[PDB]
């Protein structure tokens, strides 16, 4: 109880995850909702806009989590 020093308040606000594969599978499931946007998109830009939206979606999640305290691109 009294032994040891106390931890300093939280400074890394990224979601602390452990499994890179499990996050990837979660993103695959949620990717269906990005695809449903194609209905409201015009055929002129639909395909590149959906690729862009999907990649923006996955990037925002990946850059806001840590994999065992490490960044996404540097973990396994």
């Amino acid at each position: 109880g009294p032994l040891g020093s106390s931890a300093t308040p939280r400074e890394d606000f990224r979601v602390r995850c452990t499994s890179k594969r499990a996050v990837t599978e979660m993103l695959q499931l949620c990717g269906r909702f990005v695809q449903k946007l194609g209905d409201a998109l015009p055929e002129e830009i639909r395909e590149p806009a959906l690729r862009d939206a999907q990649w923006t979606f996955e990037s925002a999640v990946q850059e806001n989590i840590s994999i065992n305290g490490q960044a996404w691109q540097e973990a396994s």
Partner: protein
């Protein structure tokens, strides 16, 4: 920059709940970067795009609740591996 998303999610919430929130914020984030590039061509009004996008945001929030109770989100925080 882009790390504002997780900085804006309360740390008083369980980390699995924060991941569910992050899923929705990221979805809304990708919506907002795409919207300025949409114009009112015939058959595709920006009004109808916002209706579809906000409808999907609420379905995603329900979907994430389901992932929170069926263990799928929890798998992101488990390890029994090398």
């Amino acid at each position: 920059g882009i790390t504002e998303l997780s900085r804006s999610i309360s740390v008083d919430l369980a980390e699995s709940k924060r991941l569910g929130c992050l899923l929705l914020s990221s979805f809304q984030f990708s919506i907002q970067k795409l919207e300025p590039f949409l114009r009112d061509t015939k058959g595709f009004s920006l009004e109808s795009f916002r209706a579809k996008a906000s409808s999907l945001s609420e379905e995603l929030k329900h979907f994430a609740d389901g992932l929170e109770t069926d263990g799928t989100l929890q798998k992101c925080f488990e390890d029994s591996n090398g």
